[PDB]
Motif scaffolding. Structure first.
Motif, PDB file in Angstrom:
ATOM      1  N   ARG A  14      -9.637  32.907 -26.029  1.00  0.00           N
ATOM      2  CA  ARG A  14     -10.651  32.701 -27.172  1.00  0.00           C
ATOM      3  C   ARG A  14     -11.976  32.366 -26.520  1.00  0.00           C
ATOM      4  N   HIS A  15     -12.124  31.525 -25.496  1.00  0.00           N
ATOM      5  CA  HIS A  15     -13.224  30.792 -24.872  1.00  0.00           C
ATOM      6  C   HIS A  15     -13.912  31.965 -24.134  1.00  0.00           C
ATOM      7  N   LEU A  16     -13.426  33.192 -23.790  1.00  0.00           N
ATOM      8  CA  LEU A  16     -13.797  34.251 -22.811  1.00  0.00           C
ATOM      9  C   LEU A  16     -14.062  35.338 -23.738  1.00  0.00           C
ATOM     10  N   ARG A  32      -5.038  27.195 -29.875  1.00  0.00           N
ATOM     11  CA  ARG A  32      -4.127  27.851 -28.993  1.00  0.00           C
ATOM     12  C   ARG A  32      -5.075  28.617 -27.718  1.00  0.00           C
ATOM     13  N   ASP A  33      -6.510  28.471 -27.963  1.00  0.00           N
ATOM     14  CA  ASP A  33      -7.272  29.202 -27.129  1.00  0.00           C
ATOM     15  C   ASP A  33      -7.150  30.818 -27.045  1.00  0.00           C
ATOM     16  N   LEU A  34      -6.546  31.369 -28.211  1.00  0.00           N
ATOM     17  CA  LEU A  34      -6.356  32.894 -28.367  1.00  0.00           C
ATOM     18  C   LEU A  34      -7.138  33.646 -29.246  1.00  0.00           C
ATOM     19  N   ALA A  80     -12.200  17.558 -22.549  1.00  0.00           N
ATOM     20  CA  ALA A  80     -13.554  18.116 -23.004  1.00  0.00           C
ATOM     21  C   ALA A  80     -14.116  19.168 -21.997  1.00  0.00           C
ATOM     22  N   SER A  81     -14.762  20.273 -22.546  1.00  0.00           N
ATOM     23  CA  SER A  81     -15.152  21.146 -21.816  1.00  0.00           C
ATOM     24  C   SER A  81     -16.467  21.794 -22.556  1.00  0.00           C
ATOM     25  N   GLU A  82     -17.234  22.814 -22.043  1.00  0.00           N
ATOM     26  CA  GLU A  82     -18.545  23.298 -22.626  1.00  0.00           C
ATOM     27  C   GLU A  82     -17.848  24.369 -24.091  1.00  0.00           C
ATOM     28  N   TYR A  83     -16.693  24.548 -24.025  1.00  0.00           N
ATOM     29  CA  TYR A  83     -16.227  25.510 -24.986  1.00  0.00           C
ATOM     30  C   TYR A  83     -15.473  24.707 -26.341  1.00  0.00           C
ATOM     31  N   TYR A  84     -14.616  23.867 -25.751  1.00  0.00           N
ATOM     32  CA  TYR A  84     -13.954  22.865 -26.792  1.00  0.00           C
ATOM     33  C   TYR A  84     -13.904  21.620 -26.385  1.00  0.00           C
ATOM     34  N   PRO A  85     -14.112  20.414 -27.522  1.00  0.00           N
ATOM     35  CA  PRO A  85     -14.030  18.909 -27.367  1.00  0.00           C
ATOM     36  C   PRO A  85     -12.877  18.575 -26.712  1.00  0.00           C
ATOM     37  N   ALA A  86     -12.481  17.395 -26.617  1.00  0.00           N
ATOM     38  CA  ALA A  86     -11.243  16.801 -25.938  1.00  0.00           C
ATOM     39  C   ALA A  86     -10.195  16.960 -27.281  1.00  0.00           C
ATOM     40  N   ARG A  87      -9.007  17.416 -27.273  1.00  0.00           N
ATOM     41  CA  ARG A  87      -8.083  17.784 -28.037  1.00  0.00           C
ATOM     42  C   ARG A  87      -6.475  18.212 -27.614  1.00  0.00           C
ATOM     43  N   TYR A  88      -5.493  18.463 -28.514  1.00  0.00           N
ATOM     44  CA  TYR A  88      -4.299  18.897 -28.082  1.00  0.00           C
ATOM     45  C   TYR A  88      -4.367  20.455 -28.400  1.00  0.00           C
ATOM     46  N   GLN A  89      -3.818  21.107 -27.292  1.00  0.00           N
ATOM     47  CA  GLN A  89      -3.903  22.739 -27.441  1.00  0.00           C
ATOM     48  C   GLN A  89      -2.454  22.791 -27.520  1.00  0.00           C
ATOM     49  N   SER A  90      -1.926  23.516 -28.636  1.00  0.00           N
ATOM     50  CA  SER A  90      -0.793  23.894 -29.207  1.00  0.00           C
ATOM     51  C   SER A  90      -0.457  25.195 -28.387  1.00  0.00           C
ATOM     52  N   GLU A 100      -7.947  27.462 -10.937  1.00  0.00           N
ATOM     53  CA  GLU A 100      -9.243  27.250 -10.724  1.00  0.00           C
ATOM     54  C   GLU A 100     -10.199  27.748 -12.188  1.00  0.00           C
ATOM     55  N   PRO A 101     -11.222  27.279 -12.463  1.00  0.00           N
ATOM     56  CA  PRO A 101     -12.106  27.964 -13.402  1.00  0.00           C
ATOM     57  C   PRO A 101     -12.484  29.313 -12.784  1.00  0.00           C
ATOM     58  N   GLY A 102     -12.026  30.425 -13.453  1.00  0.00           N
ATOM     59  CA  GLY A 102     -12.151  31.778 -13.224  1.00  0.00           C
ATOM     60  C   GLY A 102     -10.859  32.282 -13.113  1.00  0.00           C
ATOM     61  N   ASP A 103      -9.725  31.909 -12.990  1.00  0.00           N
ATOM     62  CA  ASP A 103      -8.120  32.325 -13.286  1.00  0.00           C
ATOM     63  C   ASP A 103      -7.705  32.484 -14.620  1.00  0.00           C
ATOM     64  N   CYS A 104      -8.391  31.992 -15.928  1.00  0.00           N
ATOM     65  CA  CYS A 104      -8.166  32.258 -16.961  1.00  0.00           C
ATOM     66  C   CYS A 104      -7.775  33.569 -17.410  1.00  0.00           C
ATOM     67  N   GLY A 105      -6.883  34.025 -18.046  1.00  0.00           N
ATOM     68  CA  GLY A 105      -6.506  35.506 -18.030  1.00  0.00           C
ATOM     69  C   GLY A 105      -5.374  36.075 -17.520  1.00  0.00           C
ATOM     70  N   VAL A 118      -2.917  32.569 -18.471  1.00  0.00           N
ATOM     71  CA  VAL A 118      -3.714  31.093 -17.624  1.00  0.00           C
ATOM     72  C   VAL A 118      -4.684  30.738 -18.446  1.00  0.00           C
ATOM     73  N   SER A 119      -4.448  29.560 -19.249  1.00  0.00           N
ATOM     74  CA  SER A 119      -5.794  28.963 -20.005  1.00  0.00           C
ATOM     75  C   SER A 119      -6.105  27.806 -19.825  1.00  0.00           C
ATOM     76  N   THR A 120      -5.408  26.851 -18.877  1.00  0.00           N
ATOM     77  CA  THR A 120      -5.786  25.685 -18.383  1.00  0.00           C
ATOM     78  C   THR A 120      -5.403  25.496 -16.965  1.00  0.00           C
ATOM     79  N   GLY A 121      -5.998  24.390 -16.328  1.00  0.00           N
ATOM     80  CA  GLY A 121      -5.679  24.131 -14.721  1.00  0.00           C
ATOM     81  C   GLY A 121      -6.089  22.784 -14.187  1.00  0.00           C
ATOM     82  N   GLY A 122      -6.345  22.298 -13.016  1.00  0.00           N
ATOM     83  CA  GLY A 122      -6.627  21.357 -12.278  1.00  0.00           C
ATOM     84  C   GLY A 122      -5.481  20.443 -12.153  1.00  0.00           C
ATOM     85  N   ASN A 123      -5.714  19.264 -11.230  1.00  0.00           N
ATOM     86  CA  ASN A 123      -4.724  18.470 -10.595  1.00  0.00           C
ATOM     87  C   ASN A 123      -3.465  18.879 -10.044  1.00  0.00           C
TER      88      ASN A 123
HETATM   89  C1  LIG Z   1     -10.616  22.815 -15.951  1.00  0.00           C
HETATM   90  C2  LIG Z   1     -10.581  24.067 -16.477  1.00  0.00           C
HETATM   91  C3  LIG Z   1      -9.769  24.040 -17.856  1.00  0.00           C
HETATM   92  O1  LIG Z   1      -8.506  23.380 -18.051  1.00  0.00           O
HETATM   93  N1  LIG Z   1     -10.326  24.406 -18.960  1.00  0.00           N
HETATM   94  C4  LIG Z   1     -11.630  24.802 -19.200  1.00  0.00           C
HETATM   95  C5  LIG Z   1     -11.758  26.212 -19.787  1.00  0.00           C
HETATM   96  C6  LIG Z   1     -11.041  26.000 -21.282  1.00  0.00           C
HETATM   97  C7  LIG Z   1      -9.715  25.377 -21.149  1.00  0.00           C
HETATM   98  C8  LIG Z   1      -9.029  25.331 -22.555  1.00  0.00           C
HETATM   99  N2  LIG Z   1      -8.026  25.946 -22.532  1.00  0.00           N
HETATM  100  O2  LIG Z   1      -9.393  24.375 -23.162  1.00  0.00           O
HETATM  101  C9  LIG Z   1      -9.720  24.088 -20.262  1.00  0.00           C
HETATM  102  C10 LIG Z   1      -9.706  25.216 -15.829  1.00  0.00           C
HETATM  103  C11 LIG Z   1      -9.088  25.035 -14.437  1.00  0.00           C
HETATM  104  C12 LIG Z   1      -8.354  26.132 -14.179  1.00  0.00           C
HETATM  105  C13 LIG Z   1      -8.472  27.054 -15.033  1.00  0.00           C
HETATM  106  S1  LIG Z   1      -9.208  26.550 -16.399  1.00  0.00           S
END
Ligand SMILES: C[C@H](C(=O)N1CCC[C@H](C(N)=O)C1)c1cccs1
Ligand SMILES: [Zn+2]
Length: 139
Positions: A14-16, A32-34, A80-90, A100-105, A118-123
């Motif tokens: 959804r954020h892309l 759900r970021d969908l 938190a990100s530029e697309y959504y505030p801090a939250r639980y994603q279902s 890494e940011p660029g890998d979503c999708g 791929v929707s989230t990452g890091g750590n």
């Molecule tokens: C740090 C960033 C991340 O977790 N985000 C930003 C992009 C939106 C994601 C979300 N589902 O809300 C959270 C990512 C690292 C690797 C892929 S996306």
């Protein structure tokens, strides 16, 4: 970047989503970021209908596919990100792996088909937005 093309549907993060995606909207879930938009051309991705917890995902930041063990879809806290505030994603599934940011999708697949994207990452973790519960994507 990356989508699932099944029937007359396009499944993206959804954020892309683009202007075209929003102008051809079918369903979207911020939690759900969908987002699902309608397509003229017919798609041929097979959505898996299973409870698989092992699969393979595409990582563009490495140009490699990776086998992963992944969790069952659930409410995972996402910072938190530029697309959504801090939250639980279902409907989110985690795996030990590179993202890494660029890998979503990037598509997660098991033997039955497409599990999610791929929707989230890091750590040293990667999060996948599950699509197996969306039975309307078939019809
Ligand atoms: C740090 C960033 C991340 O977790 N985000 C930003 C992009 C939106 C994601 C979300 N589902 O809300 C959270 C990512 C690292 C690797 C892929 S996306
Ligand atoms: Zn499966």
């Amino acid at each position: 970047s990356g989508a699932i093309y099944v029937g007359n549907y396009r499944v993206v993060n959804r954020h892309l989503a683009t202007h075209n995606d929003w102008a051809n909207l079918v369903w979207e879930d911020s939690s759900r970021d969908l987002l699902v938009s309608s397509t003229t051309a017919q798609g041929c991705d097979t959505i898996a209908r299973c409870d698989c917890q092992t699969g393979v995902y595409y990582c563009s930041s490495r140009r490699k596919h990776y086998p992963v063990s992944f969790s069952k879809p659930s409410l995972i806290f996402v910072e938190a990100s530029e697309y959504y505030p801090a939250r639980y994603q279902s409907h989110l599934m985690l795996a030990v792996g590179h993202s890494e940011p660029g890998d979503c999708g990037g598509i997660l697949r098991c033997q039955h088909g497409v599990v999610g994207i791929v929707s989230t990452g890091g750590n040293g973790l990667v999060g996948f937005a599950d699509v197996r519960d969306l039975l309307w994507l078939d019809e």
